[PDB]
Ligand binder design. Structure first.
Ligand SMILES: Nc1ncnc2c1ncn2[C@@H]1O[C@H](COP(=O)(O)OP(=O)(O)OP(=O)(O)O)[C@@H](O)[C@H]1O
Ligand SMILES: Nc1ncnc2c1ncn2[C@@H]1O[C@H](COP(=O)(O)OP(=O)(O)OP(=O)(O)O)[C@@H](O)[C@H]1O
Ligand SMILES: [Mg+2]
Lengths: 257, 14, 117, 257, 14
DNA sequence: GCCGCTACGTATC
């Protein structure tokens, strides 16, 4: 069934090249050469994770012979109230080694051995504010001891936590910020959702002024709402049998907010 | 331009 | 300015013949209810002559009142961010979306002006 | 490749004879000859650890044929939540003995033996506030019993920790404070980086008034930002082919802070 | 006046 | 050295 093939396409996920993703990859390439710790900040629906995942899918692990994988960029995400053993455990697993029973000093000594030899240049920590306050001692230690850049990713709350310690606030100052879409940039992006993500049977013409007013009030410039509103509208449209989105069906979806 | 399926990048990744 | 430009209230404006007159002086007529557009007059034969309808570049779809551009400029100055047409719009749209008696008064006053249309 | 050689060099590190390092070494020689315990404090980017490594790397260990080494100065850095065993473990390893499994009193007895055997005059503890509150009993004991000047290095939080134990506070009372650069001293120091650290092919004239405004607002007087801003600007400007740093390219690096 | 490479100081050490 | 945007002093309803 032709309809079923397309409904399975819309509920999925994809990475679209955008100016914010492209800016971050240029900036992180500057930090990875310089070996310089930094952080990425911005509001919660701006797409900081997808922009970091696209950077983890560049710079793939280089496998050779029977040596350990050469991993330039390590990306981890901590669990809530992450302790010192939880951080090492995840670093060790991501590099594909098994963790066994021991004490804190052992996870630490072992983490430094697998970070050596195996070619790490950058460590990216998502949701950095799940870290317990003491673990930052181990994050700084690595960054200073090994030529490894550490990147902390998070929301404005992260900085509220960081300002609670000078020692950390100074290693990680440089900061790139993710913003919200506006003006021509929001309008141009709506065409990319239409012509590259949705690909509906005939064109909905979402760049038209009345569809932009509906979308602007709905999305407030967040790429994580634009991706959500338009899938919800396109699924409704197709499952009701429409070849495109229209004023009333998009207002039905946007009224859920 | 090329636009990547996110689950495909996961399947292709080392 | 060279490049056919005018600066006003942090906002930068572009006009249909205005690049012909870089380095010259112009009288700008504007509405405090809507400063997105500016009427440009110039002196010639010691009389004003109309020149063009300059528009705040990238805000042609958008409406700013003077007290909003002013409040956004104050906030933007104190926030330490850069000056630009959107940057000012960004410093409006959050304070818009997020109340203070003057804004609550302005909303009821607006509702009366709407009923005038 | 002349560019790549400078990118490999500039991401490195150096020690510069500065007044705030020469001052520390004259002071620590005083404490070492007099055997008096004391503390060094000051804000986190003043370069206290480089000033202490410049002390440890002077006063080199002396070797006598088949004797254990004579080691005038010991510098250790503790891990987070350091317990009595972890302090003793590290002092023992630094004097080149392997630590075998035992009870806390076995580590204590062996540590006292190697400190007295290697003829240690001074023990420098970096990031002193990683110590668990009880361990200071063992640090006071090392300093009471052996003729050792213990030096604690930390920042203003260390004082907030020392002030919670009268026995530590009244012993570690003598102190030197690391301060920020200003006026003529910041001005003169910028010239030392241009001519002794950066090695760019033409003078960047970083001490000029139009450039000192940029650098002053960026660095706040911290030597740890000055070295970071000026390495990042050199790495970046060479990858674009200029023989200098100039107003706009330095304002690009400073706009990240 | 003399300036030191932090790795030369390491190489010269005991 | 010259020029659009902010900031302080004074006056009146
Ligand atoms: N380039 C892109 N192409 C497609 N979808 C994208 C792109 N960038 C972001 N998105 C979408 O944005 C939405 C927001 O998720 P995402 O994790 O990127 O936001 P976020 O800022 O990381 O969230 P958080 O801050 O909570 O981690 C996702 O549904 C994601 O698919
Ligand atoms: N005397 C110096 N000569 C050359 N570079 C220096 C000097 N002092 C500091 N730096 C540079 O600035 C940085 C200062 O960091 P440093 O560790 O010395 O400060 P710190 O006071 O130890 O920080 P913290 O107190 O938070 O541990 C060093 O990484 C080094 O690159
Ligand atoms: Mg230090």
């Amino acid at each position: 069934e032709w309809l079923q093939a397309e409904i399975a396409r819309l509920k999925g996920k994809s990475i679209v090249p955008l100016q914010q993703v492209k800016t971050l990859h240029d900036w992180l390439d500057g930090k990875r050469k310089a070996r310089k710790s930094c952080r990425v900040v911005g509001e919660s629906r701006t797409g900081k994770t997808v922009a970091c995942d696209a950077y983890r899918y560049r710079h793939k692990p280089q496998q050779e012979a029977g040596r350990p994988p050469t991993v330039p960029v390590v990306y981890i995400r901590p669990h809530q109230k992450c302790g010192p053993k939880d951080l090492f455990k995840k670093i060790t697993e991501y590099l594909k080694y098994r963790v066994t029973k021991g004490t804190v000093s052992d996870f630490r000594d072992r983490t430094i051995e697998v970070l050596k030899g195996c070619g790490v240049e950058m460590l990216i920590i998502d949701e950095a504010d799940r870290l317990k306050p003491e673990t930052f001692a181990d994050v700084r230690d690595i960054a200073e001891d090994l030529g490894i850049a550490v990147v902390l990713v998070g929301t404005d709350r992260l900085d509220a936590v960081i300002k609670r310690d000078e020692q950390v606030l100074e290693r990680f100052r440089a900061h790139l910020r993710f913003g919200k879409l506006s003006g021509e940039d929001f309008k141009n992006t709506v065409e990319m959702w239409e012509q590259m993500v949705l690909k509906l049977p005939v064109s909905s013409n979402l760049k038209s002024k009345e569809m932009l007013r509906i979308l602007t009030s709905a999305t407030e410039g967040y790429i994580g709402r634009l991706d959500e509103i338009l899938r919800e509208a396109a699924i409704r449209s197709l499952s009701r049998g429409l070849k495109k989105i229209d004023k009333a069906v998009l207002q039905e979806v946007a009224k859920e907010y | 331009i090329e636009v990547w399926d996110y689950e495909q990048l996961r399947e292709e990744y080392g | 300015q060279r490049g056919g430009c005018l600066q006003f209230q942090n906002l930068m404006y572009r006009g249909e013949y205005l690049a012909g007159y870089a380095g010259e002086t112009v009288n700008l007529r504007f509405d405090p209810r809507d400063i997105t557009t500016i009427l440009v007059y110039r002196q010639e034969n010691n009389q004003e002559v109309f020149l063009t309808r300059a528009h705040a570049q990238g805000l042609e779809t958008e409406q700013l009142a003077l007290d909003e551009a002013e409040a956004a400029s104050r906030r933007l100055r104190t926030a330490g961010k850069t000056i630009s047409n959107q940057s000012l719009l960004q410093e409006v749209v959050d304070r818009d979306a997020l109340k203070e008696r003057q804004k609550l008064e302005q909303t009821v006053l607006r509702s009366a002006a709407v009923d005038e249309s």
